[PDB]
């Protein structure tokens with residue numbers, strides 16, 4: 001057996017990811033082991049096929065795979081810094097808007113690689129942004145179980161996802177385009193800066209009805225301390241009409257990212273982690289019992 005499976009690293013809707021050591025080298029990998037439900041096998045094979053299609057510094061790379069009759073295991077590149085939110089932002093007291101723009105720009109470079117070859121990610125959430133080394137700042141995007149080739153002139157519905165991060169076209173059961181990923185980028189950015197999800201309802205059903213209606217605002221006081229460009233970036237992505245949203249290349253040209261090409265001023269506003277901490281605690285609980293998708 002080539003891999004020594006160690007501690008749980010995280011969990012998702014298709015399985016649990018563990019630390020794995022390749023015996024013959026001592027190198028560390030991540031082992032994703034699917035839950036023992038045979039209907040998950042197509043998603044695991046999709047993830048494998050997708051990961052073998054990409055080759056980009058901001059997308060997790062595949063390594064090995066094997067299976068039993070029931071269950072598939074995927075061995076993949078280990079993001080050794082763990083999850084951006086759980087393992088990096090939430091071990092600090094404060095972060096800045098400039099930090100978040102640095103992470104989001106890298107997320108967009110990974111997405112742009114995917115979009116350029118005709119593939120939508122389809123399932124981006126705050127847990128899918130990983131950091132490659134302990135204490136580092138290089139983003140790795142993961143979880144391609146739902147990723148798919150998109151024909152912009154022959155759209156299909158998306159029937160799966162985490163309710164707090166889907167788009168209105170998903171809730172209304174309409175065809176889903178690349179602009180769905182862009183909606184999710186706007187929502188992740190809103191969550192990372194403001195520390196709350198503007199569509200969160202009391203339960204999954206209510207969250208979905210809030211997304212379906214599509215209304216949100218910058219009411220919390222934190223937003224008065226976020227730059228105009230940052231609020232503008234979000235507001236060009238969280239648009240109900242999918243065709244009005246910025247595409248990935250336009251998003252990458254947005255002036256919000258101009259601050260990354262200038263010296264880190266000694267006057268960046270310091271955003272406390274308490275709000276994000278509270279939302280993450282809620283978000284994490286959704287994964288306590290496998291998955292509640294469909």
Ligand SMILES: Nc1ncnc2c1ncn2[C@@H]1O[C@H](COP(=O)(O)OP(=O)(O)O)[C@@H](O)[C@H]1O
Pocket residue numbers: 009010011012013014015016017030032060076077078079080082083127128130142143144145
């Ligand atoms: N390559 C990886 N490196 C480090 N941790 C990972 C990796 N892949 C997954 N994880 C951990 O597992 C968590 C959930 O995995 P996810 O991609 O949502 O799997 P699935 O949805 O297929 O069950 C991630 O948020 C992360 O903590």
